[PDB]
Symmetry: D2
Subunit: 379 residues, 4 copies
Amino acid sequence: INGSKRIAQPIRWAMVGGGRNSQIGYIHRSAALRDQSFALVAGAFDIDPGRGREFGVQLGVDPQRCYPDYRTLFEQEARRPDGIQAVSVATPNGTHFAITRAALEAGLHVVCEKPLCFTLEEAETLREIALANNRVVGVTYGYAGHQLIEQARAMIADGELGEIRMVHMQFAHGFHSAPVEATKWRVGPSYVLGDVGTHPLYLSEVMLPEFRIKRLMCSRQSFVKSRAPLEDNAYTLMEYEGGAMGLVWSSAVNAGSMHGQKIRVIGSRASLEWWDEHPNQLAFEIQGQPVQVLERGMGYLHPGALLDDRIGAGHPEGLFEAWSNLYYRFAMAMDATERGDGALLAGLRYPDIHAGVEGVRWVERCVQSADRGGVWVDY
Amino acid sequence: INGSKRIAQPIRWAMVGGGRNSQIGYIHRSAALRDQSFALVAGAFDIDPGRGREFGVQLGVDPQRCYPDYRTLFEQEARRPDGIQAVSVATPNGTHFAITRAALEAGLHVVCEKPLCFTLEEAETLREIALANNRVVGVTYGYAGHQLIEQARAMIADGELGEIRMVHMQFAHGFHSAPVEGQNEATKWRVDPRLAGPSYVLGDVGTHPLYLSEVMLPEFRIKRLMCSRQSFVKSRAPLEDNAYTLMEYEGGAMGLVWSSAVNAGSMHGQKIRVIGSRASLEWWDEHPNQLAFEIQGQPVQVLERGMGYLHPGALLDDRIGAGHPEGLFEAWSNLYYRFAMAMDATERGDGALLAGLRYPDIHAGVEGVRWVERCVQSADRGGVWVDYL
Amino acid sequence: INGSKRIAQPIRWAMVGGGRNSQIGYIHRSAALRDQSFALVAGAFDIDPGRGREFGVQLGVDPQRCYPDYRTLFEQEARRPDGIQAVSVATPNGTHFAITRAALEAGLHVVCEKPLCFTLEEAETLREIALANNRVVGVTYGYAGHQLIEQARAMIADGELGEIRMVHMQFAHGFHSAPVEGQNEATKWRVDPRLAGPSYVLGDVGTHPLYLSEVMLPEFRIKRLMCSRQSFVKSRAPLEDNAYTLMEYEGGAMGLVWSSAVNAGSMHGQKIRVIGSRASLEWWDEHPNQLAFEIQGQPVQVLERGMGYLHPGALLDDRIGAGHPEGLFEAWSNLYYRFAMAMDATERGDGALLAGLRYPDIHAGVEGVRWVERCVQSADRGGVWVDYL
Amino acid sequence: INGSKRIAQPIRWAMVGGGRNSQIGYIHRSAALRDQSFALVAGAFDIDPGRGREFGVQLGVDPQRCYPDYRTLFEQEARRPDGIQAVSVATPNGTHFAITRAALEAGLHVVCEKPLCFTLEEAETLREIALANNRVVGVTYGYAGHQLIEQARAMIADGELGEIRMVHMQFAHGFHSAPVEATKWRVGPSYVLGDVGTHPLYLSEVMLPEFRIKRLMCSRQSFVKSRAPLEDNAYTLMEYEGGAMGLVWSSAVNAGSMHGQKIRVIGSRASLEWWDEHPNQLAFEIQGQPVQVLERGMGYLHPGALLDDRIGAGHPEGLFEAWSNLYYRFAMAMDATERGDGALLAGLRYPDIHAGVEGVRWVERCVQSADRGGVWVDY
Ligand SMILES: NC(=O)C1=CN([C@@H]2O[C@H](COP(=O)(O)OP(=O)(O)OC[C@H]3O[C@@H](n4cnc5c(N)ncnc54)[C@H](O)[C@@H]3O)[C@@H](O)[C@H]2O)C=CC1
Ligand SMILES: NC(=O)C1=CN([C@@H]2O[C@H](COP(=O)(O)OP(=O)(O)OC[C@H]3O[C@@H](n4cnc5c(N)ncnc54)[C@H](O)[C@@H]3O)[C@@H](O)[C@H]2O)C=CC1
Ligand SMILES: NC(=O)C1=CN([C@@H]2O[C@H](COP(=O)(O)OP(=O)(O)OC[C@H]3O[C@@H](n4cnc5c(N)ncnc54)[C@H](O)[C@@H]3O)[C@@H](O)[C@H]2O)C=CC1
Ligand SMILES: NC(=O)C1=CN([C@@H]2O[C@H](COP(=O)(O)OP(=O)(O)OC[C@H]3O[C@@H](n4cnc5c(N)ncnc54)[C@H](O)[C@@H]3O)[C@@H](O)[C@H]2O)C=CC1
Ligand SMILES: O[C@H]1[C@H](O)[C@@H](O)[C@H](O)[C@@H](O)[C@H]1O
Ligand SMILES: O[C@H]1[C@H](O)[C@@H](O)[C@H](O)[C@@H](O)[C@H]1O
């Protein structure tokens, strides 16, 4: 990657949410504006119209296209020949469904934050409106943009681990060990299952695209009792079709842990393990051989895992590179749709409406199991 | 520790098992003989009397005290004024019960290998006989000898982690990812119910970090558990080479044990993480001289063996200054000197010394058997919650 | 940082070099374009005008502002009312002096790639011209943009390490262990004196952690140094692919720099350890979000980017909450926004803002050239002590 | 290793030093008594006769063979048919020469602590007395007993690193960062050069037996000024015959460092790196390939590196195992000498009189260079 243009002109783009004091607003813009993928021309940046406009102007947005709310954004932009083509939804979880639905009905492509929405019926309603209106829905499972996730997928498909036996996933941080705005709204049918567990779950779907969950059980806890019934800790044990096992540990009360997102795929011959805090390395551990570390950008990687390198091996890339790798694919997908290039659109892989639906499905089944005291449920 | 004797004379000692080709025989002797705790004066070292006697002679044992079997060992030693006072049992799991019972009935102290036996009923029988005969029974949960386990126990009791919320345990190695039992006698018996018992990895490796949790959290009581177990090498069924045990403690803390012999690429992977409201501790058997201590909101720390900031109890067993790596042989030596002090204290009827000593004993052995039995009951019922007691 | 503009309008910007196949061209643009600091409106991107123009068009540059060479770029842009205000120079080392001088004489601000130039005389000439023309000169010591470098500087100034005794620096990678310059244009020019200068690894990688030491210890002055340099790939002689620089600071602290491109197996290996009477700090470029902080007698600590326990100056540039990994692109973005603020402040004659800004500037570039020149003088005399000034 | 006897009966053994409060006394006994190599039958354990005897009795020694001093030990033991055959010298550095010389003249085999002695003339005097009296002198370069040091030697000899270019050694701990009995005497022509620098120097001699130092320079400092002229920090840069370079960083003022003994051997093709605090792993880093970690006890190791395994791979061995590996070789060497088995004696490798001499030579040359302001000197 050298900043060459992927599409003829940047997608005309807005955000809803991601305002001045938001945790995630900035990485959406840093990734979307990079390499001429998107141009930020409008937004409803803040729950408060006045702060949305002040912030919007500082981002270089036309003051008149800093709108009080998503409805006004979609209505007013529809009247302009240079109106937005796509919107990123970076609001709290409870508004994802309504905003995404409104954007799709207005004929806009959408990038929606995870978890996509609360219920599986909402998720499949967004999917059917997206399909009817021929719109791209991206979902910011940002960690999936790291090159070594593709390396892992390519190695598993090539049989380098032998027969897959176990998938061990965690996203277990300590930032909510204590009863500490962003946290207030998080504390919806779930907290950490949707907030963090869905991340390495989606990494498992990228690495093992043919794996199907047969049944699962989930035991969830509110260690900070005032969060009940929202869980700040959960254990999900899964049986895949064919007899492989999966385990997801979701947590916001793993005291001392800075992030702790890890995925270990264990085969008959070898394991791989990836850790989000050191995203440029992939452990590759053949039983009976010295353990190995695979590095981003090295010539021994599969060709697919080298495509998105922005600097030579040994220079650390980070999560902004991963997000940039998703956003250029989002832009290529939206552009392909506008030009009616069904061929390009068919060859692209990115976290899409189907990834969003599967994350919502998984949370729903975990909550069903957990509310019943951690019993097996059919997936 | 400077090699000073702990008891007036070494305990007169034998082994059953632990012969020439055994995996674990050597660490028993290396730990028992150290610092004048035990003297190896007899044994039945091998399933084959001939190989047992040839090996016994190489260990410096009198050829006439290399016996063909444990029955002969106990009978012939009873007829000597310098007869053994204690025996270590390092045979496959299926013989632990019979040998330990025979040794207790012959009036001997015992160090029995884990797992103690197959059934909770066997375990309670050995406990009754050990009590009736006033004998010490040690169990070689060897990892519990590492000083930083005592550091973790002292910190938790002192409230340094806040309120305990989770205990995450694994012992997940990759050595049996392939069907190596075809080629490897030690693996072979582990995958035969007649020889290994109701389980493979739950008893073989899961009980290790479980016992570390009992040392760190002595007042925790498991309320209920569930266990899902797999035979990834299908020929091992019904014995599991992988298992997940999820536990609810009284008080609402959660425990998780991952037991595995098919974690391909893992050299050992025994880890325990204790998670509290304020902080976490994490210990890893392959780097036993360090303890991760992670206070939420503060820089992570590593606590090092032998440093002046440790609790006094965690410094007692240091054999060399901080920074020099101790290993699993030091951990086993720390259990065996305690075994010797317990056995000597019993012979001298020193109830006071006996009360101050902490070592893996008959009760630790019984709890390990109880845990495996409950896991197997849950797993055989499709991994459903079962009452622990 | 939330993408808020730092200056009223983006600086009108070009590059010389950094074309389609370049190693470093992209990170310049990724950092400069971010957060509305610079706008890329022209360039001479390639040694080959045709490849420069085709690439320029893919970058969204007007085909008529893709110029064949730097002279044409400066001349033609001067004839436009929307002419460039600043240029980044990403060419091989041998052209830095001529291009930077030409840009300064054309009244342009400059971001010049390290090393600034070949000789200390060239460096002092660029400094004089930059001062006469009131122009900012940034130097892309990019690793200095990492927040935890500012954390280390703040801790040292606060006396958290005690009295500083040693500074241990390396940048020792293995990419040129084999003679890959046969095959690789970027390696090829680095091993030719005409193109690369008086040194290879001293200037190419040694100057990076050296500049980190100047950021962390701004009041340290090198008194004298010695340098032993080797050409392990003999065809590179007289340019070194390995070097040891030992330095005595005024005050009696010692510094060590290991510069290498033949550290086989090393992916980058840029590290700085600052050792004081009370504690040490250690930073490693491949894991830039952590800082080891090791107080003697206490548990080692790791300081994490974005945590509330950091000094306020080390939190200013956080673009995402603690635990999410930033990378070298964030470090470069942190230097480029400062470059833009410095250039804008100069144009508005805002002496006050200019005094508060810290970034690698003409003086950092001169000191890097001085250090290489002294090392080469020592090495050519068989690695003897030489006076630094 | 399964505790099988290497020699027909244990060597009759004494210590001088290594008493109740000594730092190193215990590991000598733990290693020497193991696997029936040595039997502790006498000693002069303490500078104070009374404390030597009290401690001696607690170690199981005949009270009458706990002697006030080394002269009395050697004289009285010579009168007994069951008299000592060998002595380990664990006293402060200044007494090594006199005690070792006396032991050799009394016809005893000796294990002497490093550094062997102060001067090269003393070292070559011990060598000539040892040779004249046909005695074994072992030197407790204990780290050399770790199996993966042999693995490194075997890999280098087999050309696995390509042509050797650089040897980077450190022993840099922080325990004397502050002006803190054992430390008092350490603070002799040197402190950290002899106390710690000689350790990884000897590892380089085991790994690269054919390497010869051509010239070196050493810059040494007294950061705790009251130690002057003894150095608590030193840098030694070395040129080997053939143009490889070596670097030794010796330190007791590396604040926060728990031990920091490391050796990295860098070849044209690959590097190896060993760290004493994690002695069961060896980094093996082929340029252009994933980095690897070699583990103690694994089947992929050279046969020589498996001989001393006392437990299966994955169980951590420590420095007591390394010392035990030196002491059984010391015992086999002494026994071979007594039986006049010149054949066995010739096949054994252990840190011996020659290792002791080379450590003393290296310290002398470093001190010569450092006293002259860190100038190159011929080796
Ligand atoms: N993909 C990932 O890695 C991450 C995703 N997220 C997701 O991003 C979303 C936002 O999370 P945070 O940034 O942490 O929340 P936040 O609470 O930090 O910020 C929310 C922002 O949305 C604005 N806002 C709220 N309601 C609005 C409305 N109706 N219209 C317009 N603006 C509105 C607020 O003014 C604020 O600027 C959530 O869905 C969360 O799950 C958050 C962090 C990481
Ligand atoms: N505490 C720990 O960390 C470990 C415990 N163990 C336990 O130690 C025991 C032995 O395990 P391994 O050494 O791996 O087995 P192994 O198969 O390697 O050795 C068994 C030994 O006992 C001998 N033996 C078998 N039956 C005998 C009998 N009836 N009488 C006398 N000798 C007999 C065999 O000849 C052999 O010497 C098992 O209970 C196992 O669970 C094993 C490894 C580690
Ligand atoms: N700050 C840092 O971390 C790094 C700095 N650098 C520095 O950046 C500079 C470039 O290095 P690389 O990108 O590795 O070199 P490279 O060989 O990869 O690329 C050189 C580029 O400049 C172009 N070029 C050459 N001469 C030119 C001229 N007269 N006019 C216009 N374009 C010209 C070439 O066509 C090519 O696009 C060097 O000074 C190097 O020291 C390089 C890598 C990292
Ligand atoms: N090989 C290795 O890894 C190590 C070697 N050493 C070396 O071991 C030797 C001793 O070091 P530490 O144990 O640290 O010293 P220390 O000061 O801790 O103990 C010295 C012991 O020798 C006794 N002693 C002193 N003079 C004596 C004499 N004339 N006769 C009999 N006993 C005497 C003292 O009573 C004391 O027991 C030194 O040469 C040191 O360099 C020390 C630590 C590690
Ligand atoms: O490999 C394991 C390990 O040695 C355990 O410590 C032991 O309990 C098991 O029996 C053995 O199979
Ligand atoms: O590989 C290195 C690295 O990118 C350094 O950051 C740079 O200064 C050098 O020029 C380059 O060769």
